[PDB]
Design a protein around this ligand. Structure first.
Ligand SMILES: [Ca+2]
Ligand SMILES: [Ca+2]
Ligand SMILES: [Ca+2]
Ligand SMILES: [Zn+2]
Ligand SMILES: [Zn+2]
Length: 220
């Protein structure tokens, strides 16, 4: 347990900012009871599959002010997981973008070139950016804030079983909608029901909540 805590608090930025004080920062950030203790609710939280983007701080120094300055956003589906038919993957990403296009002045268009603003990639372990995935479960995906090159891109851990219904695996639609939020410039939310909360929860309800819309509206 203390080894899991050490790795979680390190990976997601709490240890850098700071086990008590770092656990307090995590409990505040995740809206858990703020005991300062490695207790059952905190351990359950740490064992919950979630987004690979850090909570406090950032992957790295990025370029620019971290939002898009044009409105026709392009995305490239660089490769495909074998877990779902191509057309089902295409439609999952299209629906995830449709969530954000309704609440922003942005449009999203699928392109077939590396030139895209948002390059979407499936990969496993170390997949080319120095931020390796971790095998099945754990972190499910990550993305990078708007800007040039890797910025704006969205990566999905193909050691996960990608699905869409209730049942085994993880909803590619829900995780993509979350990661696309980062690709548009959002940080994680501390509201457990919000789309931009970092933990994965399956739902058949509408993914966007007030906090997500408030955040994207603030930017655009
Ligand atoms: Ca994983
Ligand atoms: Ca990019
Ligand atoms: Ca997979
Ligand atoms: Zn995230
Ligand atoms: Zn990556």
């Amino acid at each position: 347990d203390r080894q899991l805590a050490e790795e979680y608090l390190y990976r997601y930025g709490y240890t850098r900012v700071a086990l008590g004080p770092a656990l307090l920062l995590l409990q505040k950030q995740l809206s858990l009871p703020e005991t300062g203790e490695l207790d059952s609710a905190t351990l359950k939280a740490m064992r919950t599959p979630r987004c690979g983007v850090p909570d406090l701080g950032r992957f790295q120094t990025f370029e620019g002010d971290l939002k898009w300055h044009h409105h026709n956003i392009t995305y490239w589906i660089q490769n495909y997981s074998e877990d779902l038919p191509r057309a089902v993957i295409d439609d999952a990403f299209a629906r995830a973008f449709a969530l954000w296009s309704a609440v922003t002045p942005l449009t999203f268009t699928r392109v077939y070139s590396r030139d895209a603003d948002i390059v979407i990639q499936f990969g496993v372990a170390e997949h080319g950016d120095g931020y390796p995935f971790d095998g099945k479960d754990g972190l499910l995906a990550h993305a990078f804030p708007p800007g040039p090159g890797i910025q704006g891109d969205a990566h999905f851990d193909d050691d996960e079983l990608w699905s869409l219904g209730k049942g085994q695996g993880y909803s590619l639609f829900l995780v993509a909608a979350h990661e696309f939020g980062h690709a548009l410039g959002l940080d994680h939310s501390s509201v457990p029901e919000a789309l931009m909360y970092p933990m994965y929860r399956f739902t058949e309800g509408p993914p966007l909540h007030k906090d997500d819309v408030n955040g994207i509206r603030h930017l655009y």
